[PDB]
Design a protein around this ligand. Structure first.
Ligand SMILES: CCCCCCCC/C=C\CCCCCCCC(=O)OC[C@H](COP(=O)(O)OCCN)OC(=O)CCCCCCC/C=C/CCCCCCCC
Ligand SMILES: CCCCCCCC/C=C\CCCCCCCC(=O)OC[C@H](COP(=O)(O)OCCN)OC(=O)CCCCCCC/C=C/CCCCCCCC
Ligand SMILES: CCCCCCCC/C=C\CCCCCCCC(=O)OC[C@H](COP(=O)(O)OCCN)OC(=O)CCCCCCC/C=C\CCCCCCCC
Ligand SMILES: CCCCCCCC/C=C\CCCCCCCC(=O)OC[C@H](COP(=O)(O)OCCN)OC(=O)CCCCCCC/C=C\CCCCCCCC
Ligand SMILES: CCCCCCCC/C=C\CCCCCCCC(=O)OC[C@H](COP(=O)(O)OCCN)OC(=O)CCCCCCC/C=C\CCCCCCCC
Ligand SMILES: CCCCCCCC/C=C\CCCCCCCC(=O)OC[C@H](COP(=O)(O)OCCN)OC(=O)CCCCCCC/C=C\CCCCCCCC
Ligand SMILES: CCCCCCCC/C=C\CCCCCCCC(=O)OC[C@H](COP(=O)(O)OCCN)OC(=O)CCCCCCC/C=C\CCCCCCCC
Lengths: 88, 300, 308, 50, 316, 316
């Protein structure tokens, strides 16, 4: 999360108030990295951070449900017997 | 593969040259993707849009890091020659087209079916016990051979496709050598870019160093050498397909050596692939002669 | 056949171990990342705010980062995935510990061979029809084979005790893993107060750092803890099933209830244990193999072969 | 097979409900206020999530 | 492959140990290639070529990023110990040499031919339908011909392999090399594992290019390269112990003399002689893997079984 | 594969050496791709276009990061030796030439056809039970396969003695390998010392940077020296193997194989003294395993054919 500080604040909110010149924040690169890490951990929503892992967990559970009867011995024995004698 | 015998020494040699060409193409491609760039520095002093160069102290440029990255990107896009940027993609495309030309003789279902039929009957004749008895001195196999002869002497599509593939593979070699030799001198380490970004950077002309140019030089030279080899091979291939007529095959030597002298002169596609057989190893053709002579059929 | 002797809890533990190995590999690839911890010094020198200049180079920041990574971050937060890999390797090795023993493997193979060849024996169906020729001679030979099995397996009790040892090892390893992981899972924190004394090098002494993947490592640790807890619950059920019924004593009276012939005895030791294995797999195998244990059944089959 | 089917369909229902509910919280612009003024000097930052 | 029979439990144990050592070698090499460096900071106060160590504000060293990179490279080249730099390459080379020692048995063409022929006839005898009948003690024409050919091939193969022992000699040499290299590896790794330090005081005399003489450096991967090394040492110890046991297994009993008294006394075929040399060695290896293979093969070399086989062939 | 029977110990040793040099070539090329930079710092005081090399505060060069990168690229291109830059590519090319020279035996269609025919007939003679039955001194299918196999062997013997193409090809391959070994050792031993960690570059970029001479550190120079020493050792071993192979070809006439010991051992004492290419492939067979030639030699003597036809007449 590329974070840039708000120079003017008003009640815990950014104020948003002859050539143009860049804003000087006087921050080091490492202070910027610290700010990025802190805001990424704290204020980014949990869904954006953990979407791929939630998807992987859901797909693994889906695959386990689709392949549970193939691995459960009580049903797997019947299934292999049926497949073998039916094919042969 | 199944056609381990229909490929003579030029075919396999060009196939391995194509493999080495493909791997150097892939290496150059990852080279251009990963770390290919150019480091661009302006001339501070100016004399008619140049730099004059009128203890030592470093020259300050007052350029941000992002201004340097912008100058790098703009000069890479505008003033680096397109050969130095797309040489590996051109090599990869050329090798892909070469492999397609080599394997179109394998992948087309009509020619594939004809080649598989000939390979299957040739292998089952090679492992047949009766050819040894005939050479010392299977009826359904003989009838199958006669039926295959009648089927395959109708047209010469396989020989025509081989001829067309040879012409494409030699003219593409000519074009590749011409354009690569003409443009291989445009891969220079030090280039000059005049991109007119003075409104964004403050400087007009820059000297840029292309770090991977020299590698992209020698690889290209290496590539040229490989292409030359390919062309030379293809050159003699053209000779092999212009000195003698491959649509007519004479069994004169085998029928003179063998006791049976009634083997006819094979023609068409059968003649062409029997010429390929004779190029690989004369044993297969000598052995398939006795499965063709009607006198040996009467003895069978 | 080594799949048949594996109940559902063993396959469940094997799949949990595979998932735990995947978690450990993912944690190691997480540890591959160069950027690990980010540190900033403390007490540095329409309201408009201005940044605080720490007067530090990038190399000084990197030195502070590595000093605080080495001497302020907890060892668990740095070496959790390696511990997970080691623990899951030991769990996977001990899963088939009663399988890989030489005598255990020999008796298991003999049992599965005898049981499978009994399962495709026509005379088993013949005796089931009687209850509810050449094959008679084969049945007589298979009866001598069953007697040979009884003399070869029942004299020992290595299999049941060794399985109990493996299950107890799994239970105690689950207990130790859960214990130290619950004790040290709180050490994986985002904000770390680093207090290395590099004042002579960087000018500052107190630093506040954040472990960038502290949240991901905490989630991985909780997922590993859940996997280990499920593994332990499965092993606790295995221990309960092992000890609540004596696997040194298989009562064939359940066969006696519906099948009229009462001559089949109550097997003991390893035979009873492996019959309980096959009962957990498929009780039809045991209820069919029961009829090959009697002696008056052999006399009848002998009478039938005599008439033939 | 029956139980696997009901488990899969109820998990699909839960997945679609929570994913559709929380899918709008993935935003490019995030305003953070983390109270690190003692280490940086600013309290509120405007971050971009690429 | 087909040589899974010839590998006893110690061989497969060392195979897994070598695989694990190769895995940690690849991991260490990846870390060394990707992120092995050192962060060197100059010492502002110098005293006898050492750091004095005599709100708060930072120390300004007036060094560029590239001066810092040059200092890091020079003090990584000159002052960090060679063991910390080249530990992953050393473990990779050692694992490769151990694997080469293990597989030189399978790759040497004379011993490869002997082992392959032995394994082929042992597998076709183990799956021979005549073995079940012989252990249970008419014959099909194809089956009888196969049994006769197998008996003659076993006899001529025994005469072929009994002349000399080259498989046992190679196994002896491989075990000796594997224990000697284990001793050397343990000695030098134990001696040099203490040089992997996190904090290194470098003094490279680049004052003309940088302005400072002594720098203090942090080697970030040192501690990891410590524990991995310890882990590596542990694995080597296990390897060595296994090899030591194998060496003892070579010396407690004569491996070139095999007695069929465990089979010829139990079976009715008491005419089985004592095989010797390489044949004895591979048969002992089978006994280490599974005595069933040797027990089922033992009927194919006695001459009483040959007499009864010829009688059954005549009866057909 | 099927050609494993034709490869003696020198061939498999060279194959494993070559795959090891391919591994080090891939590693060197990957590192040359990824971390083959150099760190160049300008010399603040220039004396006679050189470096004077004449509390503490850092030296300020007033150079941006991009000027440093430009200096690095220019001095890496100009003043780093070509060996230190293209050692892995040269090693890869040499190893590929070694592989091509070793495997061109199996790819040239005439020699490949001869070798495949030889392997096929040897393997089907191995599978033939009548070959063992004759050496021990009738089934219909056994008789058919036998008669086909002896006729096969006579046809192959008439075919292959015509020209010694395979032996000459092996001679040319060994000569190419040994001369390339000599050239590789010469130029690599000459140029290995040019890989230095510390280099001085003088590239005349004062117009863009402001400094003339720079001192550069090549971080991969010592690792490249280690890799070059490893490559030199591997090429020395490969060359010694090539010396032994050439001495093996020149010690005795491989185009002249006598079955005198084989026919003296066996009852058949009329096995002809074969020559040329068949003698050559049979010498390679003896290098792999003498049993193959031992069991194949019964198909060449006329007495064996006489007794085969006598037994066929008894059967028919
Ligand atoms: C025996 C020796 C064999 C050697 C083979 C080594 C294979 C790799 C060789 C290619 C090296 C490529 C160099 C890439 C450098 C790119 C720039 C750089 O320095 O990257 C740093 C950057 C920092 O991380 P970020 O994601 O920015 O973290 C903060 C944001 N989350 O990334 C890195 O950490 C390194 C970048 C990739 C290099 C490693 C690639 C291969 C890694 C293999 C992982 C091995 C894990 C093994 C798993 C099981 C372990 C028990
Ligand atoms: C047609 C080809 C299709 C395949 C292409 C796939 C692309 C590669 C996939 C991996 C993505 C990772 C690339 C990351 C690039 C950006 C990281 C970055 O900023 O890197 C900075 C830095 C640039 O400077 P240096 O290389 O130090 O310059 C020194 C001058 N000699 O680059 C790096 O550190 C390397 C970055 C990671 C490289 C990893 C991938 C390189 C693959 C190597 C190909 C060759 C492998 C085998 C060699 C064969 C023997 C010759
Ligand atoms: C149906 C079941 C639904 C499951 C989803 C659970 C969601 C609960 C939400 C909990 C929550 O919101 O609490 C916050 C909390 C985050 O807290 P902070 O970062 O402090 O707050 C950020 C500010 N928003 O959210 C969470 O904890 C989210 C939980 C994520 C769990 C997802 C699972 C991840 C497990 C990792 C293992 C996967 C590894 C795969 C191995 C790879 C092998 C190749
Ligand atoms: C025996 C035969 C020996 C072969 C070696 C030839 C050496 C000749 C040396 C010529 C020479 O020194 O020329 C200089 C010149 C360097 O010039 P600059 O760096 O501009 O130097 C400026 C000088 N101040 O050197 C060279 O040209 C080096 C020549 C070596 C060429 C190596 C070719 C590399 C081929 C790479 C193969 C690619 C395969 C990739 C595989 C892909 C797998 C995934
Ligand atoms: C003779 C045969 C000629 C071959 C093609 C010639 C094309 C030249 C066209 C004329 C021209 O100037 O084109 C410019 C233009 C570049 O222009 P700029 O970048 O603006 O540079 C300007 C230079 N100052 O040139 C091109 O586009 C070159 C086109 C060649 C590339 C062809 C496309 C092939 C793409 C390959 C696909 C890669 C996929 C890789 C798969 C990876 C799988 C893992
Ligand atoms: C079981 C019960 C465990 C109870 C707790 C045991 C540990 C007690 C505390 C040990 C401890 O602190 O050790 C520290 C000590 C020193 O390191 P630092 O933490 O940097 O020291 C500086 C201070 N932070 O670290 C340790 O020993 C940590 C414990 C070992 C972790 C690693 C274990 C596994 C090592 C090998 C892993 C191999 C993975 C890759 C293999 C395959 C490659 C593809
Ligand atoms: C006891 C036996 C010891 C075995 C190793 C010998 C070590 C001798 C020590 C030599 C030494 O210290 O020299 C230093 C010198 C570098 O330091 P300088 O700056 O020159 O000297 C400053 C001193 N720090 O380091 C060395 O020479 C160390 C030698 C390393 C030997 C290890 C060999 C590694 C071989 C690489 C294998 C390549 C395989 C590639 C496979 C590719 C797979 C993808």
């Amino acid at each position: 999360m590329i974070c840039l500080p708000c120079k003017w604040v008003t009640k815990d909110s950014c104020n948003d108030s002859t050539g143009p010149t860049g804003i000087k924040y006087d921050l080091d690169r490492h202070q910027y990295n610290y700010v990025d890490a802190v805001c990424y951990e704290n204020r980014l929503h949990w869904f954006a951070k953990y979407f791929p892992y939630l998807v992987l967990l859901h797909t693994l559970i889906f695959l386990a449900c689709s392949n549970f009867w193939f691995k459960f011995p009580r049903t797997s024995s019947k299934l292999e017997h049926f497949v073998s004698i039916l094919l042969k | 593969p199944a056609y381990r015998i229909l490929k003579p020494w030029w075919d396999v040699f060009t196939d391995y040259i194509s493999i080495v060409m493909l791997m150097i193409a892939v290496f150059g491609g990852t080279l251009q993707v990963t770390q290919d760039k150019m480091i661009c520095l302006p001339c501070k002093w100016v004399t008619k849009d140049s730099c004059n160069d009128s203890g030592p102290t470093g020259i300050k440029y007052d350029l941000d890091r992002h201004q340097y990255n912008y100058v790098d990107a703009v000069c890479y896009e505008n003033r680096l020659h397109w050969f130095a940027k797309y040489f590996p993609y051109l090599v990869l495309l050329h090798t892909l087209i070469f492999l397609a030309c080599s394997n179109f003789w394998f992948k087309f279902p009509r020619t594939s079916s004809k080649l598989e039929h000939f390979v299957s009957i040739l292998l089952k004749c090679f492992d047949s016990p009766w050819t040894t008895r005939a050479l010392s001195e299977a009826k359904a196999l003989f009838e199958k051979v006669k039926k295959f002869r009648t089927h395959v002497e109708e047209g010469d599509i396989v020989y025509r496709l081989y001829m067309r593939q040879t012409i494409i593979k030699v003219i593409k070699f000519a074009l590749i050598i011409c354009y690569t030799v003409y443009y291989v001198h445009n891969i220079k380490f030090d280039v000059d870019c005049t991109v007119d970004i003075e409104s964004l950077t403050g400087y007009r002309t820059y000297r840029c160093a292309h770090p991977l140019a020299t590698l992209f030089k020698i690889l290209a030279s290496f590539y040229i050498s490989l292409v030359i080899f390919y062309g030379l091979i293809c050159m003699y291939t053209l000779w092999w397909m212009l000195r003698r007529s491959l649509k007519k095959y004479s069994f004169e030597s085998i029928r003179e050596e063998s006791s049976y002298s009634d083997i006819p002169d094979v023609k068409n596609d059968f003649a062409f692939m029997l010429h390929l057989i004779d190029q690989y190893d004369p044993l297969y053709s000598k052995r398939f002669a006795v499965f063709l002579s009607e006198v040996s059929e009467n003895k069978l | 056949a080594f799949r048949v002797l594996k109940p559902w809890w063993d396959v469940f533990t094997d799949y949990l171990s595979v998932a735990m190995l995947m978690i450990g590999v993912f944690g190691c690839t997480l540890q591959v990342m160069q950027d690990k911890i980010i540190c900033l010094p403390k007490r540095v020198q329409t309201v408009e705010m201005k940044g605080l200049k720490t007067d530090l180079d990038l190399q000084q920041y990197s030195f502070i980062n590595q000093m605080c990574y080495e001497r302020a971050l907890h060892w668990y937060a740095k070496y959790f995935p390696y511990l997970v890999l080691i623990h899951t390797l030991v769990f996977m090795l001990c899963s088939n510990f009663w399988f890989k023993f030489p005598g255990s493997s020999s008796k298991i193979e003999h049992f599965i061979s005898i049981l499978g060849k009994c399962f495709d024996s026509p005379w088993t169906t013949r005796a089931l029809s009687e209850v509810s020729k050449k094959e008679g001679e084969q049945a007589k030979a298979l009866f001598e084979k069953v007697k040979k099995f009884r003399l070869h397996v029942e004299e020992g009790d290595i299999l049941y005790a060794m399985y109990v040892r493996q299950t107890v090892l799994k239970v105690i390893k689950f207990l130790i893993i859960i214990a130290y992981n619950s004790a040290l899972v709180s050490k994986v924190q985002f904000t770390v107060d680093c207090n290395v004394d590099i004042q002579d090098m960087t000018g500052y002494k107190n630093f506040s750092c954040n472990h960038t993947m502290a949240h991901l490592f905490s989630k991985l640790s909780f997922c590993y803890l859940c996997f280990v807890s499920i593994y332990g619950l499965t092993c606790l059920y295995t221990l309960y099933w092992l000890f609540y019924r004596s696997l040194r004593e298989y009562s064939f009276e359940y066969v006696r209830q519906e099948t009229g012939i009462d001559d089949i005895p109550d097997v003991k030791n390893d035979f009873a244990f492996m019959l309980h294995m096959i009962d957990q797999y498929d009780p039809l195998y045991s209820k069919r193999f029961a009829v090959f244990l009697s002696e008056v059944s052999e006399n009848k089959l002998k009478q039938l072969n005599l008439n033939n």
